[PDB]
């Protein structure tokens, strides 16, 4: 009615304002830099022990221990240097699609189709891992949960909302709303001040943790976004979706910067991660292998093959020493 | 070589043995995915089992002839179906419940859901057990009102047997992969153990076919 026209005019003004800042393009600026050589990565370790599809994984802050969640109701903590199973937590609900590692390493988190985020305490006087908390209140399946400061955690669910909890009390400190479709992933900023959430409506939103307010909204994808990852600088990010294209946006310019796509790729992207310096971009696809793109030249720098099924989880250590990939054939692989 | 890393390796090996034992124990269970359209008779089928915090998924454990059955109810997910259906790729069978007495073309919606589920790229080689619930109400309705209101394309009388058979075949012919997977159809009866016996027979046949495919034959 009288406000839909106003909203359309505001959208047109936004488009015109963000168009005027696109004086140049990143590709035409960076085509005068030396291309990175053919990136060959070798499999150093293979972590076996899962008896079902591996749905998520996360590195520790020390970049030696990692946590992996499988659909057979198991959380496993691996010491990657020696491939030793430090801990094996049995989950109450076998339907888990996410996992997280606390920055201090004291807790782990899991979640899935039961709409409950379970927080397990690792350092106990009893010598065993016990479920410290069971946060409930989401009306949809948990899709991604990220620890913030070892006492508050940000979660996203299929009810088109995100939440910021308080672990001691188990209550939603803040609720972020504004997405239309199911939120499929989130990624905190390096300083843990803002974060970005990608939804199934082909849209990403930049939320500010304080005040529960949305700063900016980015569009451009043609299908649901399945993964997201901040640039190490903290002023940009990259999103992968089902249309087999990665998109790199920047926060300050508030518009798209680059698109990474290939004619031979038609399968969607399940995971996206950057490198320590931000030059490389790791992206796992459904064609059973991952791709290493040049984030500044939009050309394929390498291919990581060796998984017999769809690559579901992917992570890079804090020091950038190795890349851990996990697929649906119940195997994790470390690449260096 | 190792000073107390040997003890860590021993702990890892014990954890490995425990994981193998747990996997072997969990591999002796029958996992059935329960589906329906608008909770049409799902509760009645569930109540036939013999033996509150979470509202996302529902677990049902029971045992028949010492064989252990697990049923998952996902009727309260309310999200996109394609976002979590791939989690159930390894279920033994899909128990699909359809209310016979069915108006806002509810039967058409049930048929659409059945077609979407049966032809899914994840549920190939997965058998479907069809449960046509509420036969007495269907009998009363067809005696009162002709089935032609829902099905103007019908060229038959108003007897119960032929209409039920027609519904059965029009549900069974929606399966495009007639060779890869079979559909077991049953009419829900008030008898206590007949439904469980039918489910057990279908599961036994599915297990036999799976072993035939796995043991080198076929």
């Amino acid at each position, epitope marked *: 009615d009288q406000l839909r026209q106003e909203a359309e005019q505001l959208k047109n003004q936004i488009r015109d304002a963000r168009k005027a800042c696109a004086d140049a393009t990143l590709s035409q600026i960076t085509n005068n830099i030396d291309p990175v050589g053919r990136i060959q990565m070798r499999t150093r370790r293979t972590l076996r022990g899962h008896l079902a599809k591996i749905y998520a994984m996360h590195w520790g802050t020390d970049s030696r221990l990692l946590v992996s969640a499988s659909q057979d109701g198991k959380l496993i903590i691996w010491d990657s240097y020696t491939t*030793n199973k430090v801990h094996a937590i049995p989950l109450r609900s076998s339907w888990v699609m996410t996992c997280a590692y606390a920055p201090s390493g004291n807790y782990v988190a899991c979640g899935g189709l039961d709409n409950i985020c379970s927080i397990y305490n690792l350092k106990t006087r*009893e*010598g*065993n891992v016990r479920v410290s908390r069971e946060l409930a209140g989401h009306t949809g399946y948990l899709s991604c949960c990220r620890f913030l400061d070892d006492n508050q955690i940000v979660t996203s669910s299929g009810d088109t909302t995100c939440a910021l909890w308080d672990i001691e009390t188990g209550q939603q400190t803040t609720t972020f709303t504004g997405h239309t479709g199911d939120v499929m992933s989130l990624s905190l900023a390096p300083d843990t001040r803002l974060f970005v959430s990608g939804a199934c409506d082909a849209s990403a939103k930049l939320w500010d943790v304080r005040e529960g307010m949305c700063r900016q909204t980015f569009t451009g994808h043609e299908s649901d976004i399945n993964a997201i990852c901040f640039f190490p600088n903290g002023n940009a990010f990259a999103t992968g979706s089902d249309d087999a294209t990665c998109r790199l946006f920047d926060l300050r310019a508030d518009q798209e910067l680059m698109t990474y796509s290939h004619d031979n790729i038609i399968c969607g992207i399940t995971s996206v991660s950057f490198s320590k310096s931000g030059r490389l971009l790791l992206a796992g696809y459904d064609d059973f292998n991952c791709n290493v793109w040049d984030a500044l030249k939009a050309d394929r720098a390498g291919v990581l093959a060796g998984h017999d099924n769809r690559v579901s989880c992917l992570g890079v250590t804090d020091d950038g020493m190795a890349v851990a990939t996990g697929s649906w054939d119940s195997f994790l692989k470390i690449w260096n | 070589l190792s*000073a*107390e890393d040997k003890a860590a390796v*021993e702990r890892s090996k*014990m954890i490995d043995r425990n994981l193998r034992e747990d996997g072997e124990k969990a591999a002796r269970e029958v996992k059935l995915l329960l589906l329906g359209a608008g909770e049409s008779g799902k509760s009645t089928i569930v109540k036939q089992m013999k033996i509150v915090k979470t509202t996302g998924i529902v677990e049902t454990h029971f045992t028949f002839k010492d064989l252990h059955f697990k049923m998952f109810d996902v009727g309260a997910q309310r999200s996109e179906r394609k976002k979590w259906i791939h989690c159930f790729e390894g279920v033994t069978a899909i128990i699909f419940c359809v209310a016979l007495s069915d108006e806002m073309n509810r039967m058409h919606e049930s048929m659409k859901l059945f077609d979407s589920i049966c032809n899914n790229k994840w549920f190939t080689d997965t058998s479907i057990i069809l449960f046509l619930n509420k036969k007495d109400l269907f009998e009363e309705k067809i005696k009162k009102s002709p089935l032609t209101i829902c099905y103007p394309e019908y060229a038959g009388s108003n007897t119960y047997e032929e209409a039920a058979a027609y519904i059965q075949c029009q549900f069974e012919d929606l399966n495009k992969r007639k060779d890869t997977k079979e559909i077991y159809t049953h009419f829900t009866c008030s008898t206590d153990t007949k439904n469980v016996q039918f489910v057990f027979d279908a599961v036994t046949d599915v297990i036999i076919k799976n072993n035939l495919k796995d043991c080198g034959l076929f």
Partner: single-chain antibody
Amino acid sequence: VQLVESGGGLVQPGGSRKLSCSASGFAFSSFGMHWVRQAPEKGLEWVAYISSGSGTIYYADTVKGRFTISRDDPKNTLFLQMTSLRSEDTAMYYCVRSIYYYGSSPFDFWGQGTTLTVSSSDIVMTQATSSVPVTPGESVSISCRSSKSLLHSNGNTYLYWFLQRPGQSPQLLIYRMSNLASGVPDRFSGSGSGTAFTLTISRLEAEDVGVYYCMQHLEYPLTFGAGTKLEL
């Protein structure tokens, strides 16, 4: 969490006895168990060790052949059966728990000990000083020395600092020469290199007096070495 031992008392030479160690308040099946012995007015001395699941069993050289260590998991208990008891076995026995994984702290909790009286080792750790007169207002340094390089090829130095208060059982102060144990005041600190190690106390209190021991965990003989006494 508590370990309660029983079976002590007076035994004639050449006899036999069985000590029991009952555990309550923790997952017994996941912890390896050590039997340690302290002679009257002498230092600690390792005796026996049984792993989790009874995988590997280790004995001290001086007690090999006549002692037998076993565990019962359903009843949460640990047995030490001694046969052919001699005159140097009269001591007080401690039941210690230790769990081994990446980042764990073995030897964290010690039992209460039982007194048994009898009527009628390639690595040697030396603590040169025996007693240190100390006032409760300054900083103390306790030095330990080893005959072998305790540093391993993986970068982990295996030295443990324990404190035994007068009339109580020892508690783990520091594990792996640098990491502070849980529930230990920050005034304690540890450092060292390869063969020479130091424990520093910034400011003592009435609870900082006692005997300090430095144990090794590189080769399994697990020698202890006499401790350093801090009083007054």
